[PDB]
Amino acid sequence: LSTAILKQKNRPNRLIVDEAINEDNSVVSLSQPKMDELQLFRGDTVLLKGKKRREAVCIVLSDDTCSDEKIRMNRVVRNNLRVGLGDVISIQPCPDVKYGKRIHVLPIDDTVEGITGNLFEVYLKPYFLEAYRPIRKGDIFLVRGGMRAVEFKVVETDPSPYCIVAPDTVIHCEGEPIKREDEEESLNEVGYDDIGGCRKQLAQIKEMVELPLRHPALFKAIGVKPPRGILLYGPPGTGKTLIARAVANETGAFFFLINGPEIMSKLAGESESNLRKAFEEAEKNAPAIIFIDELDAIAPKREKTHGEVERRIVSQLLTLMDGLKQRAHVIVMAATNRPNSIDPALRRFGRFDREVDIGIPDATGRLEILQIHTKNMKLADDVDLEQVANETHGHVGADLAALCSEAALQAIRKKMDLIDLEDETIDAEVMNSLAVTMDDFRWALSQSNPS
Amino acid sequence: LSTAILKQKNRPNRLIVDEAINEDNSVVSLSQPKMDELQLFRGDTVLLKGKKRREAVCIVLSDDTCSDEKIRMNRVVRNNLRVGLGDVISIQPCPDVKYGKRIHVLPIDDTVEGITGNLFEVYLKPYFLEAYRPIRKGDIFLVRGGMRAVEFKVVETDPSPYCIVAPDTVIHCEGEPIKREDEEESLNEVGYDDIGGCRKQLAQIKEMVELPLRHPALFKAIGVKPPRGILLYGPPGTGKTLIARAVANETGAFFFLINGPEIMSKLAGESESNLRKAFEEAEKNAPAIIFIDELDAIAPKREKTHGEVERRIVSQLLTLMDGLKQRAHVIVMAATNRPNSIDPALRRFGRFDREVDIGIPDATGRLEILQIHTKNMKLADDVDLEQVANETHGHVGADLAALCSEAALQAIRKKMDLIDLEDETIDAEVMNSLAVTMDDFRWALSQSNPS
Ligand SMILES: Nc1ncnc2c1ncn2[C@@H]1O[C@H](COP(=O)(O)OP(=O)(O)OP(O)(O)=S)[C@@H](O)[C@H]1O
Ligand SMILES: Nc1ncnc2c1ncn2[C@@H]1O[C@H](COP(=O)(O)OP(=O)(O)OP(O)(O)=S)[C@@H](O)[C@H]1O
Ligand SMILES: [Mg+2]
């Protein structure tokens, strides 16, 4: 009823992802009635939108085994859009695309051990030649070259974000191999799907932050000024920083992060300077979000704080907050676990005058969190997460994450005699048999702890 | 059950050390069935791993008087491996060894008083000539030269850590004699065998620190992020610093020590600089451990601390803790005797979110501690350490060490009339007759003190 903003809404161009029959990295398939509905001719360059602000440029073709409201794409495209089979995606016409001038690609390290020969000659040239491939900056793509398959990242493009790779396009693969861990920590990146039992609050954040920045016209038309300071509060480990990361990755707005301790660690004056630089940067760049994490570190009650520099910072912040005129289109978000220790001046009208309580999860919420945490864990049949959700009365997300870590450590302990600390590598069979059992969770539960 | 990680496990190449029949420094002996089991031909160069990350390179020969699961090696090899008879060692094939280019050896000072003549001509040349000896950097080896025996240290090698000494190999013995006290303070170096009544906890430290650094694949395969901040706590004198020294000497990881007071002793800003330098160094160097000893010195509750530089340091630390991304492979360990005085921000998820309680030893633990302390003491038949363990209720390791020191002082007092404070040297007979009696311990016990 209030939650209405979160609802997906059906559109002509909003389609479900199905497995591809055409296994090319550049190709997406649609049913013929759907192509006509969207005025898409065969072989047109299209823009697809996935989760966490991710995009891919593809060339569209007609398929008959494909349903009307479905789209077919391989793993490579699904990866780039950070989507799995069943997720909804946007499809957009894209006749804007320039022919590429210069691109910069690099291989992923672990998929490149043994023989250089020539990476461009063996792999990239046969992949691109006369194919007129659309590629986007940040794409990870797989190429076979007789022997095996190498993954490459698009690091740079000379036409702004995306281009067509013509014979003209100079293909550079100069630098060091891109580290596996870099790109896995890039897949790691937090989205709204990684945040559990916070539906009501996520809806509030989209209302107060996302809505007025993407559609200022609504608030201006109705005759209402958008609130400009939103403060997330709640007990330690409920998900504030996690939401911070999610927003950063999920928004159309330019995002600027400030960590409380990161500011207070700096020299006298050089801290006030970074604060100004943050606000000046946000004002300069588009509709923007400034996230002040751990606000109580920078803005405690001016009455009860010893240092002159510490008092000067609170004053610096207040001045910045009021320094933004309406037409700046900058919203300031902040998170704390002790809201009662922040200077009341900052919680006045026009400053942080809106509050979102990220509280303790209910039984239902805990279940969401356990499902979110265990999505990469190997679990057994007998593991009942609903059971674990109910037995965790005082637990917040951080306690549940830790519980999952200790359940997993127990399963490692059960496999100990087949493992030793001294050998270089762990046995292959032992690695595959690793499942976290219900019994492990009951051991984790017996050890667990509140607040 | 939980202690499973500490268990040693039987392997084909894990052998018990027996006394050698072949008394050459370069030679180890095995039974003929065991050499076939490990595909080791006669006279192959082998790598031996001992305690405290110690290694020796030997040439392997077949022995018949030797049992299947035993290895024969002299005192020189046992010293270099820091093992006594009955300890288990690894044996590894080693066909990698290059011929040496340049080696640097130096004599141990107290074994070299009177006549230089020439050390290479009299000692080293006849020891190495046509022998093709494997040697490792850091090896201490004894050589006889007609008259007497001189100990030498391998200070440097031109092929990286170990090489074969061929006729080509230039043998330098240039510098000052290596000091006895330095090499005895090197044997002094603390390992896991020097820490008593702490089995459960050592298992915890190996789980949380050693296992994720040596085997990150396990945690990544199971789908779990390894905890990155471990805090040792407990009353004064329980063995925290002792464990820190043990870990430093025992791990495969690069180790960096930070002492609380050592940091706070520095000029404003130059202390923050050293904290950064420690993290940048640890990030630069392999899998790494950073040990912040006496944490409560640098990180007290920001709420109750007077100086601006003191507040700025806690902020500097928090930022660094969060500054490590998952893929850094750096665990931070810390020790304190007042855990409740640390800023709670530091003890949150992602920071020092794991705790190891080094508490008061039980009766069994005290006995372990007494056995570890008195391993170099001269004791009498009537000394019952089990009796002493039982009468020491409130005692921690530091109290027990102190008790041992006072017991020994009492035995010195018993010998006083045959000693005087004025004479240059103490009589030789008086030195040998020194034994610490049970009576001395009962005097020590009479004087003892809790907490
Ligand atoms: N509601 C939640 N949904 C999913 N995961 C969560 C949630 N809350 C906590 N977690 C997990 O716990 C971890 C720590 O939570 P944080 O986001 O750091 O909590 P926090 O609210 O920022 O705590 P403070 O106030 O900084 S002590 C996250 O990385 C998540 O893995
Ligand atoms: N568990 C133990 N096993 C063997 N010796 C110990 C043990 N605990 C203490 N000792 C001895 O007592 C000495 C002092 O112990 P420390 O390791 O300094 O204690 P600590 O826990 O670091 O105390 P704080 O908190 O720094 S006052 C050590 O050098 C050991 O000789
Ligand atoms: Mg947080």
Residue (of A414, A411, A399) closest to A447 by Cα position: A399
Of the candidates A265, A411, A419, the beta carbon closest to that of B312 is on: A265
Q: Decide if B4 and A182 are in contact by the 8 Å CB cutoff.
A: no
Domain ranges in chain A are: 1-96, 97-189, 190-359, 360-451
Residue of A198, A201, A240, A242 with the most ligand 1 atoms within 8 Å of its CB, for mutation: A242
Closest atom, ligand 1, to C-alpha of A365: 1
Within 10 Å of residue B446's Cβ, how many Cβ atoms? 9
Beta-carbon separation of B327 and A182 below 8 A: yes
Which residue of B49, B311, B345 is in closest CB contact with A307?
A: B311
Q: Which of B7, B207, B315 faces A264 most closely, judged by CB atoms?
A: B315
CATH number among 3.40.50.300, 1.50.40.10, 3.90.1200.10, 1.10.287.3510, domain A190-359: 3.40.50.300
What is the DSSP-derived secondary structure letter of residue B4?
Answer: G
> Which are the contacts of A399, defined by CB distance < 8 A and separation ≥ 6?
A237, A392, A448, A449, A450
Give the best residue of A187, A189, A296, A409 to mutate against chain B (max B CB count within 10 A): A409
In this structure, what token pair is assigned to residue A348?
A: 């006045």
Length of chain B: 451
Which residue is listed with tokens 């830790």? A402
Find which of A109, A242, A264, A374 to mutate to test the B interface (most B CBs within 10 Å of its CB). Answer: A264
Residue in B49, B211, B318 nearest the CB of A421: B211
- Is the CB of residue B201 below 6 angstroms from any atom belonging to ligand 2? no
A122: distance to nearest CA of chain B, Å? 31
> Mutation test of ligand 2: which of B241, B296, B356 has the most ligand atoms closer than 8 Å to its C-beta?
B241
Fold of A360-451: Helicase, Ruva Protein; domain 3 (1.10.8)
Percentages (nearest 5) of helix, strand, coil residues in chain B: 40, 20, 40
Residues A189, A184: Cα–Cα separation, whole Å: 9
What is d(CA A449, CA A306) in angstroms, rounded to the nearest whole number? 35
B238 annotated binding-site participant: yes
Ligand 2 atom with minimal separation from the B195 CA: 3
- Asked whether B198 lines ligand 2 (CB < 6 A), one says yes
Find the radius of gyration of the CA atoms of chain B.
Answer: 25
Q: Which residue type sits at B345?
A: A
For residue B331, report the distance from its CA to the centre of ligand 2, in Å.
Answer: 22
Distance CA A28, CA A36 (A): 15
- Residue A237 labeled ligand binder: yes
Please report the DSSP string for B115-176 in residue order.
--S-HIIIIIHHHHTTT-EEEETT-EEEEEETTEEEEEEEEEESSSSEEEE-TT-EEE--SP
Alpha-carbon dihedral of residues A243, A245, A247, A248, nearest 10 degrees? 160
Written as six digits, the tokens of A49 are: 């939108």
**Residue A391 identity (one-letter amino acid):** E
Q: Which residues of A touch B2 (CB under 8 A)?
A: 413
Which of B211, B306, B327 is closest, CB to CB, to A306? B306
SS3 per residue for A75-99: HHHHHHCCCCCCCEEEEEECCCCCE
Q: Is the C-beta atom of A401 inside 6 A of ligand 1?
A: yes
Looking at beta carbons, which residues of chain A come within 8 Å of B218?
A: 412, 419, 426, 431, 434
Resolution in A: 2.8
Does residue B15 have a known ligand-binding role?
no
Can you spell out the DSSP letters for A331-389?
EEEEEES-GGGB-GGGGSTTSS-EEEE--PPPHHHHHHHHHHHGGGS-B-TT--HHHHH
Q: Among positive and negative, which fits the CA dihedral B124, B126, B127, B133?
A: positive
- State the best of A262, A265, A374, A429 to mutate against chain B, taking most chain B CBs within 10 Å: A265
The residues near B423 (Cβ < 8 Å, ≥ 6 apart) are none
A180 to chain B: closest CA residue? B327
Our answer on whether the CB atom of B166 is closer than 6 Å to any ligand 2 atom is no
Q: A80: annotated binding-site residue? A: no
CATH of domain B97-189: 3.10.330.10
Length of chain A: 451
- Establish whether residue A367 lines the binding site of ligand 1, counting it when its CB lies within 6 angstroms of any ligand atom: no
Residue B339 is classified by DSSP as G
Distances in whole angstroms, Cα of residue B348 to Cα of each of A144, A223, B290? 46, 44, 18
Name, in order, each residue with C-beta under 8 angstroms of A172's C-beta and a sequence gap of 6 or more: A102, A103, A104, A105, A156
CATH topology for A1-96 is Barwin-like endoglucanases (2.40.40)
Give the Å distances, CA to CA, from B132 to B104, B118, B123, B346. Answer: 16, 22, 16, 56
Report the structure determination method.
Answer: X-ray
- Return the closest-CA partner of residue A321 out of A241, A293, A313: A313
B326 and A377 within 8 Å at the Cβ level: the answer is: no
Q: Are B266 and B307 in contact (CB under 8 A)?
A: no
Nearest chain A Cα to B14, which residue? Answer: A422
Residues of B in contact with A294 (CB under 8 A): 345
Coil/strand/helix, residue A136: strand
Percent helix, strand and coil across chain A, each to the nearest 5: 40, 20, 40
- Ligand 2 close to Cβ of residue B398 (< 6 A): yes
CA separation for the pair A253, A284 (Å, rounded): 12
